[PDB]
Amino acid sequence: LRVIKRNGTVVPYTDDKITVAITKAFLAVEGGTAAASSRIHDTVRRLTEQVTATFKRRMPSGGTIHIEEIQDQVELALMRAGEQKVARDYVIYREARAAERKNAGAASDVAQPHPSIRITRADGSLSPLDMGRLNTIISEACEGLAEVDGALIERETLKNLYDGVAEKDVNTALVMTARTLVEREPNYSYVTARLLMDTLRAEALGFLGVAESATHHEMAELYAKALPAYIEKGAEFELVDAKLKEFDLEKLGKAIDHERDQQFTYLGLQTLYDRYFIHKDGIRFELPQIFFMRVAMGLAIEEKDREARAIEFYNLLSSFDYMSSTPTLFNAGTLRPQLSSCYLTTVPDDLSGIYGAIHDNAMLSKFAGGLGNDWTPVRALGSYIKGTNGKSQGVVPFLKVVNDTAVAVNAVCAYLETWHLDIEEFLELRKNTGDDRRRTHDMNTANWIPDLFMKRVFDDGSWTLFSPSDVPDLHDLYGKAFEERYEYYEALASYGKLKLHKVVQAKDLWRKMLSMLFETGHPWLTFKDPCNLRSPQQHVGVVHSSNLCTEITLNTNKDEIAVCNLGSINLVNHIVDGKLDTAKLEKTVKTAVRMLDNVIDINYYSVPQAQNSNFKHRPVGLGIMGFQDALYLQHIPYGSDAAIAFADQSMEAISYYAIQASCDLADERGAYQTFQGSLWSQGILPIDSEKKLIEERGAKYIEVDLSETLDWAPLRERVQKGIRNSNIMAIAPTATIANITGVSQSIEPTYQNLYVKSNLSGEFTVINPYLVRDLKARGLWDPVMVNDLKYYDGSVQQIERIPQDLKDLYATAFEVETRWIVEAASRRQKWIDQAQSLNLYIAGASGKKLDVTYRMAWFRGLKTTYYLRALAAT
């Protein structure tokens, strides 16, 4: 055994040097009277033995170890023996002599580090790294952001570079060490996006022949030069609609604001660049502000004032005040643009029309469309079939054809009404096990529940199943009319005059519905009668189901496939110093509704009955997003009366402006064809729809708040003169567009304040930017807090240092009681003419808890519910 001295030399391993060292430390804390002590000597030689033994235990016949490796094991032996005073003075003294070595080494230091790395160009030529341009992009990137250190990033980058780096991976190196900093300061996310933009500018501009490279503020003059170059190459490759050349590109080139690139989060820019920016040969040649300008232009190709409206639409989009739906963003400004990709259908009870509906499913899904299918009219197991002289097997064998079409065309949701004789088989279609002939693992399902069924649940009544072919009028009836006609058929079956039927207990079927929702996630629960009694289009059709995402309530028939034309307001951009900017909200809603009305005319239609319904009724669906983040800005916890109040009044405000905007389009473009007879014609607004719903169903089964903070009487008058759209509002999921704009999803509570993305190199944690901002004000943002958040997967509950006001404000989806989410949705639904996609989160998971929850959802006048997220751990 030998030891590597501090500097090179090798010497034999001598226990004495260890024994002397430890003895020095004992004699330092004690006096000299400890010099001759059997105790010290016995202790030291014991510590020296277990140290020397440790080196023997890990190695065979001799070896070599570092001098510091021995010092560490000496401290270990002293420490494990509980020698606190001797161990710490050993550490202190040892560190004092390390300081003298470190300092003396720095005094004798010589400086060589030079020159610089040579950046390799694409053509293969070497070039010295530009330090001036490197400082420019990182400074313009840290511009306007707090607690960001540009010099810190430049130093950490400069480390991981080698002679012969390419300018390609010099930017990625800047990005790599920029997102590693978002964990301790979220504002680096903006810095990370601004650095990545440098690659995009070089990529796009170099492709367009404008410039081989450029900085941010250099875009103040280059965005106008790049736009006409972009349109010319875009149309050349048939990636952009040639009609866009009819715009005044010089005027639009000046309207572009290059500073809005600074708004992007890293995730938002990645999203657009990966999937939305136009490209050729893998090269993205569409820059972000030109992307927003393309969408604006595509939405204005038929406006009288092309440029003025295009600028109005570009300003709304590029500022993140509002964001068009995913299909609009992707296809606006391109040939035959699919601007809407959400449809509702109803399937007729004949074989030709069944397979006509299968055919429509395939065509509508050819470009990623989502579908709701009303299958209630199709006759159930045991029904007679003339011509065949046999008996039907019901809807499920046809749903299997639907299921395999969805697989073949690359989602769809089937709806069935609760008295349908196939309902029991329907509830089990998504079980993991069992007969596969009775499963549709690639198709969604939803219950179309009449009020009467829930009434029978509340009252422990019975419930009769029928085949629709024996009761063909029930599906189209609703409200009192349905309940009278249904009880007539019920009495008929009890007197043997309607053979094909099944009597069950309503509570038993209800329990089966909730257990399948819990076990399989399906079928979802949607309510037929509020969707129909509150539909503004009752005079010209019937709502036969909702859509794939359960927020749309539009009529369907033989000649009408309803189309959802969607967009969402960004509530975050309408919160100022803690308050809702009522004034700015009206301006954004007015422009949003116009853009959505334009979508109807520009949209390219594949099936004629989808064009027919859109042109006849002109429904749109204006939603919201950033609700949870808007609560943060007001310091309102989602589980409070104050959040329920904000949800009520914010929807009432948007609703007023949205309805008012539709009146303005009616003055300019004329009311939609079927306006005459609609609820709007009768002066029955959504707030009035709630009142009549309570009258119809009865206060015994529904209770909803009816408060109002605005004056609707003047608007209730102007609406009767005409509006442009049969439906205005719908709150849909906003997965992509919330990520693009950097806000929370629609109305969802935060699912978790922390997530650990891991998809390239290492894993990068992302923490709720609002949570960290509040923890700074309290002075509670530090390394230990970060280590606690990871341990608790982002939950601020049960960490002592956070005060209770923040534990409540940053409660996660599974630690907010479900009643808050339902009551909030209930008050938003008072002002929405369609519905809202409502995910529910339930910890504890019991059939009892599901019962009280979905009874409450119905009792509070909700039209739809969506996914159930259930945990049985609590």
Ligand X SMILES: Nc1ncnc2c1ncn2[C@H]1C[C@H](O)[C@@H](COP(=O)(O)OP(=O)(O)OP(=O)(O)O)O1
Residue number, 75 or 748, with CB nearest to its own copies: 75
Does position 1 interact with its own copies (CB under 8 A)? The reply is no
Residue number, 329 or 347, with CB nearest to ligand X: 347
Task: State whether residue 598 is helix, strand or coil.
Answer: helix
Burial of 776 (0-12, 13-18, 19+ CB in 10 A): middle
Tell me the β-bridge partners of 127: 119
Annotated binding residue 409:
yes
Annotated binding residue 56:
no
- Binding positions for its own copies, 782-801, rule CB under 8 A: 782-784, 787-788, 790-792, 798-801
- Tokens 């004000």 belong to which residue? 777
Catalytic, out of 142, 342, 531, 549: 549
549 catalytic residue (yes or no): yes
Residue 17's binding partner among ligand X, its own copies, none (Cβ under 5 to 8 angstroms by kind) is: ligand X
Annotated binding residue 338:
no
* DSSP calls for 31-65: -STTSS-HHHHHHHHHHHHHHHHHHHHT-SS--EE
H-helix segments, 639-682:
641-669
CB of 702 to ligand X, least distance (A): 35
Residue 392's binding partner among its own copies, ligand X, none (Cβ under 5 to 8 angstroms by kind) is: ligand X
CB of 87 to ligand X, least distance (A): 10
The encoded tokens of residue 91 equal 């550490």
Residue number, 36 or 106, with CB nearest to its own copies: 36
CB of 772 to its own copies, least distance (A): 17
Q: Quick check: 288 and 317 in contact, CB under 8 A? A: no
Query: Site map for ligand X, 315-354, x if CB under 6 A?
Result: ----------------------------------xxx--x
The encoded tokens of residue 841 equal 């989160």
Does position 12 interact with its own copies (CB under 8 A)? The reply is no
Q: Quick check: 264 and 216 in contact, CB under 8 A? A: no
- Tokens 């005059």 belong to which residue? 497
Dihedral sign of CA atoms 848, 854, 856, 858 in order: negative
CA quadruple 197, 202, 207, 212: dihedral, nearest 10: 160
CA-based max dimension of the chain: 117
**In one letter, which amino acid is 805?**
D
Does position 67 interact with ligand X (CB under 6 A)? The reply is yes
Q: Quick check: 614 and 566 in contact, CB under 8 A? A: no
Residue 778's binding partner among ligand X, its own copies, none (Cβ under 5 to 8 angstroms by kind) is: none
Residue 747's binding partner among ligand X, its own copies, none (Cβ under 5 to 8 angstroms by kind) is: none
Residue 684's nearest CA partner among 719, 711, 724 is: 719
Residue number, 304 or 437, with CB nearest to ligand X: 437
95 catalytic residue (yes or no): no
Annotated binding residue 133:
no
d(CA 529, CA 768): 40
Nearest 5°: CA angle at 483, between 847 and 372?
A: 65
Which phi and psi angles does 590 have, rounded to 5°? Answer: -55, -45
d(CA 526, CA 537): 19
Residue number, 431 or 801, with CB nearest to its own copies: 801
Does position 775 interact with its own copies (CB under 8 A)? The reply is no
d(CA 770, CA 790): 16
Residue 867's nearest CA partner among 445, 346, 531 is: 445
Does position 11 interact with ligand X (CB under 6 A)? The reply is yes
Does position 46 interact with its own copies (CB under 8 A)? The reply is no
The encoded tokens of residue 230 equal 């972009």
Does position 515 interact with its own copies (CB under 8 A)? The reply is no
Q: Which of 4, 28, 145, 362 binds ligand X (CB under 6 A)?
A: 28
Residue 88's binding partner among its own copies, ligand X, none (Cβ under 5 to 8 angstroms by kind) is: its own copies
The window from 91-99, 314-322, 506-514, 834-842 that contacts its own copies (CB under 8 A) reads 91-99
Annotated binding residue 528:
no
Catalytic, out of 75, 185, 428, 551: 551
75 catalytic residue (yes or no): no
Annotated binding residue 39:
no
CB of 82 to its own copies, least distance (A): 6
> Strand 621-625's sheet: what is its strand order?
322-324, 566-570, 621-625
- Binding positions for ligand X, 85-144, rule CB under 6 A: 89-90, 93-94, 97, 101
# chain residues binding its own copies, by CB under 8 A: 42
Task: State whether residue 596 is helix, strand or coil.
Answer: helix
Nearest 5°: CA angle at 102, between 99 and 104?
A: 105
* DSSP calls for 692-716: HHHHHH-TTT--------S--HHHH
Q: State how far the alpha carbon of 743 is from the alpha carbons of 438, 569, 763, 838, in Å.
A: 41, 11, 22, 18
Does position 379 interact with ligand X (CB under 6 A)? The reply is yes
Give the interface with ligand X as residue ranges (CB under 6 A): 3, 5-6, 11-14, 17-18, 21, 24-25, 28, 67, 70-71, 74, 89-90, 93-94, 97, 101, 349-351, 354, 378-379, 385-388, 392
- What residues form the annotated binding site? 5-6, 12, 14, 71, 93, 97, 101, 349, 351, 366, 379, 386, 409
- What residues form the annotated binding site for dATP? 5-6, 12, 14, 71, 93, 97, 101, 349, 351, 366, 379, 386, 409
Which residues participate in catalysis according to the annotation? 547, 549, 551
Give the interface with its own copies as residue ranges (CB under 8 A): 16, 20, 23-24, 27, 30-31, 33-34, 36-41, 43, 72, 75-76, 78-80, 82-84, 87-88, 91-92, 95, 782-784, 787-788, 790-792, 798-801
